[PDB]
Amino acid sequence: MEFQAVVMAVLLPVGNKPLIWYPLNLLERVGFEEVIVVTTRDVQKALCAEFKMKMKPDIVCIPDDADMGTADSLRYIYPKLKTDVLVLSCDLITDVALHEVVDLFRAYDASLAMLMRKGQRDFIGVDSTGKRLLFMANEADLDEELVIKGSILQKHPRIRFHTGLVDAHLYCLKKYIVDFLMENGSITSIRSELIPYLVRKQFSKSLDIYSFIKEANTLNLAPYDACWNACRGDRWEDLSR
Amino acid sequence: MDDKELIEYFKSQMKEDPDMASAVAAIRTLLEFLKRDKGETIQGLRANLTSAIETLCGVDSSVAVSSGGELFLRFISLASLEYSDYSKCKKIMIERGELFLRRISLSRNKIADLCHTFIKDGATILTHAYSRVVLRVLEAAVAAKKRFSVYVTESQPDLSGKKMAKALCHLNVPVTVVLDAAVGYIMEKADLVIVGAEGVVENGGIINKIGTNQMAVCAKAQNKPFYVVAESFKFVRLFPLNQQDVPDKFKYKAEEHPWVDYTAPSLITLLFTDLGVLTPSAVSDELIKLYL
Amino acid sequence: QVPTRKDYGSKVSLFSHLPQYSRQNSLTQFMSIPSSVIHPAMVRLGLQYSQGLVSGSNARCIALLRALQQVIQDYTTPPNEELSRDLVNKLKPYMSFLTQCRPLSASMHNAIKFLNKEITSVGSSKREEEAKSELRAAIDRYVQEKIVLAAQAISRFAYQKISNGDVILVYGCSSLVSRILQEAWTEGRRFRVVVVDSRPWLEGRHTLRSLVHAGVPASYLLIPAASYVLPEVSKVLLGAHALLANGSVMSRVGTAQLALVARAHNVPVLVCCETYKFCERVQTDAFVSNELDDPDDLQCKRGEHVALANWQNHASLRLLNLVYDVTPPELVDLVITELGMIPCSSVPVVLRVKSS
Amino acid sequence: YDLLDCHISICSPQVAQLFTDNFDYQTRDDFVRGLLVNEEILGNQIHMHVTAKEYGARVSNLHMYSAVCADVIRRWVYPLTPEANFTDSTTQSCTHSRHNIYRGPEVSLGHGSILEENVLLGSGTVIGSNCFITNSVIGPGCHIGDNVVLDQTYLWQGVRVAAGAQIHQSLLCDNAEVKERVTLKPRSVLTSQVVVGPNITLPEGSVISLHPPDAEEDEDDGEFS
Amino acid sequence: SELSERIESFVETLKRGGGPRSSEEMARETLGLLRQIITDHRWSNAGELMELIRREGRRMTAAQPSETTVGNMVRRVLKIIREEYGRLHGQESLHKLLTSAQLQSNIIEAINELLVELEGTMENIAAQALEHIHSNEVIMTIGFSRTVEAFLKEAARKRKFHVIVAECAPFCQGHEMAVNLSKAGIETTVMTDAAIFAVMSRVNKVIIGTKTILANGALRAVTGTHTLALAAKHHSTPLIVCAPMFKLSPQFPNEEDSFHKFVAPEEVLPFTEGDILEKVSVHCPVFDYVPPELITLFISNIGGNAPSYIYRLMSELYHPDDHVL
Incomplete structure (x- = not known):
């Protein structure tokens, strides 16, 4: 076995049906007999007990500490990791055929595969084919000018930029990425620092990073407006399921 | 020593x-x-x-x-x-x-005890130069009481053809000396062209006297059979791609007068060696088998 | 079990029996992400084949052998069973799926047969780890002696034919030809090279990128103009995807055309190929056994209009994309192998001596 | 970053008005940058058209001059071709052969000389014996000696070269002359009737002319002072 | 004056790019231009008219020697003046050796009837097309040429057969024939050049057009035609050439090697390759030379003919003195 499904939670079973049920069901839509979930401990390290009342095919739950990011959660869960991982988030409501994303991880033997959607602040730049992303940054770390290296333009003279895209927080990741995460404690969150680090490190036996663009669904974001939109669309989403 | x-x-x-x-x-x-x-x-x-x-x-x-x-x-x-x-x-x-x-x-x-069976009675024999093997097989054919006509070219550089004509008249065989430039004019009257080989290349082509190649081409044009006789020890691990590719150590010292030509296996009907009657592929098979 | 890839588009009546898939349609859409049929050494290789990430026959063989080494390493015996037979019975579906993704070549057929023979030769008393280690060692030795040493010996042999001040014509992206030319240029040989390419793959540019990187003077042109350039060509050198017992050469589509025109222009023809690529099966034409690639690659953008845009909407219209063809033996003057420099008619002889 | 500036623009009288209002503007780049920094006021969006099937370039230096000459000789700017004679003049009549060997009228190639490829010879030229000319352009009325080697050079009209010279990637203006046993390094330049003395090999970067100060060296019968 | 500027515009169009794409349009325009030349320019004897025509035809041919429709139309006109002068005032063979001012209207009417007969060459070829295609045949063509497309798309009105069209790379114009002909229900197939021989065994006969037919019967066609003819000869399949009568030009292959037409190598190799374009020499000819030994038949507006007879048609169209022009 080489994929080990991993679910992050740092959520709340809100909605008509429990929120965490929605992504987990997707895992049982395509194989994935076993799954690892990590719960929060700042509120209470017992949400696993509450979640144990569901009826999924098979569940594995692990408590965490009070303060721990996604990268910190992976750092804690590493001893249970033996192969490539598939990190998801509890807040994610989508009907994506997952087989596309892993195909980028499969065909090109990439070091990272992610899902990215046309939202309806953070800049990303992919190549002409729209598969291998080349640059990514956020306005938080940029003052007024966006900087592009000469070498990347030498290797790729045509970059297509996207601005309003929304991440789905789903990533196929290699094992040596987790080993490097072990080697350095300076990383606390995946999205905040880890992905841009790899993107920059692609250009110093190299690093391959790919993103798949979708046009159907986003994740239930922290704002309550996203939860309301997810509730509105849940009837249509579950009509097929 | x-x-x-x-x-x-x-x-x-x-x-x-x-x-x-x-x-x-x-x-x-x-x-x-x-x-x-x-x-x-x-x-x-x-x-x-x-x-x-x-x-x-x-x-x-x-x-x-x-x-x-x-x-x-x-x-x-x-x-x-x-x-x-x-x-x-x-x-x-x-x-x-x-x-x-x-x-x-x-x-x-x-x-000799194998090649003479192909000489049809009353047929016409065409030969290029003084080759001892073809003379021996003609002796064997005559011993079997067969009648045939023989044409021999003159081999312009050194007139070995006249020497072969003398050696054949010594055996009471109807023989005729013809010019090296008349082969085509004679190719219509021939029935099968037997010729000796100076050497045999990998695929079955023959290294032989300079005038052989044109005779082989003309015979192939008329679709007449073309037989070559050679011994086992004349095999070699050479392989020219054309007449130019032949090493110069064989062409000369034996304006420009090369003593040697190469004939492709596609123009050769059969080979007569002591192993038997062979297709041109058999030579390559023997050379492959000899060297592991 | 694995589903069946859907044939895409109508086919020519003469090619009704051959399959024809589309690059857009990937079989993995109907397979579990955590591959449950068997471990996913299948899917990586199958996707890289179907999507055409690896093209060279030697590259395909090396990738298949690496993937199957991973298969053997991850494989474990089931209780109350014999490895020497269960391994092959389990490996057959791998071959079926790989053929579904893309039809196999002669080199991969020989590799599969060799590995099946090796597995069968494994005794029933030896231990699991020893068997796995010896299988991996046998695969490594096969790769070494059948690719690397063979290429070096063939380059040494070909160094003799390549004379100074001549012109050598090549075709397509073939690793053996490129390595031969590079090594010959290394040894001080001075010559030119003429590159002939053909649509739609246009992989010939590959070797061009090599030739300039090796400093070799070169020229590039499409296949139809070959008849224009042959008069100044002194030798034609072609790589081969397979050799058949009848001496014919199974290769890329344009090989037979180049051989025929070279014969019509009185130019010697060389075919360089390794012994392991020799195949016992025979055929007389490209119709009985071929492979039809995606016809959508035939569409080209000339000016501001694509003529073959909606080709599916014309019932009478048909598209074929051949990838292989057969050159008759009588148009071939050389086969350059580690055994030496042989005629085409001697191809079966090698099959006799290497079989035992 | 894959575009090439062909220096071709389609303009409106608004461009003239903006130029006659904005005094500081001097070049096209200045106008483009000024319009793209003064966005909200007089928006005036600028549009772009990209072509990928036709050739267009602007020569601005010897590097671009050599690149454009190599492209033109190799028929990259068809229908424009040295043998096409797009300017209907008698002198530029040419014949096209294998390897893009362009030959004018009255060339009189010498015995043993070899034109390898991508070579254009002006009318009235004279070529010596055993010459080796490659990827070069020779102007009309030139005169070349024996055993001369020319690689990627460019000779204008009236240039005279003595026998035995070796010339690589240099440029010789009209009416220049080179004596015997002279070797020119790549990127050399000879301008306006400067004659290089015998038995000298100029360095890599060697631009010479009659005018003293601008040229790195000025001379008429040598290279040492 | 006005005729002179029209002539200059015609020459510039030939030099830059052919406006009227079809060769028949070239022939009609050349004949019309010669008509205004004859009517407008003043001349007393036929000799000055002939030399003026020689000068104008020399200029037009030197504009673009790649295509020869203008040249042989001019030669046909010159033969017309020669014939009219001989008729109103009074062929090299052994028989000849052993034996020994109002013509303007006649010239004009001769040119007019020449145009009239030139109008219907396509229709005559189509009319005679049905006698060379049988049911369930397999036909292969190359590139694009309106003559053969009209041929097949009218001969399929009463027959059913299969047609294979090989794209003439880089100018993949065979797709245009494929689309147009499949828009008539012919069950056609689109193929690359590299597969020609690969399929050539399973083709009954091959019909092709041409750009110019030389005196010896050898022709100049699109690139890759020579390979197709060689494959035909190898498989001994008959080869049909559909060419109207004006595509017959009296030159010979060995003439200065300005025979092919080399276009920009952009089509063969895109400019985006970059650095490697310096050390690499690329050639993109658009025409190939097919020898007469590989040709089986010639179909023209007058009927069928053998290549060995082509020379005779030269004597009936062009006087020997006007070959050089």
């Missing part, structure tokens, strides 16, 4: 028996030199033997000499393959060389 003594040994062996093939005399010279060498190491044998091989090749630039030398050295390697000791090796060298010499001596008669 010195190179000079080798040279007079080779020349005397040639002169004593004019009927002996050049490669046979070369192999006999190599065997005699091996007989009196007083070497101790097989590598010392190989170096001296190959050096004598280039010496004789300089003496006689024929392809047959080089083919015989290559066959001799491969025989040395085969004998040394399963004899760690050197004295047993040397004795086996001598005895197998005696057997090899007697077999190549009988090879011409072996070819």
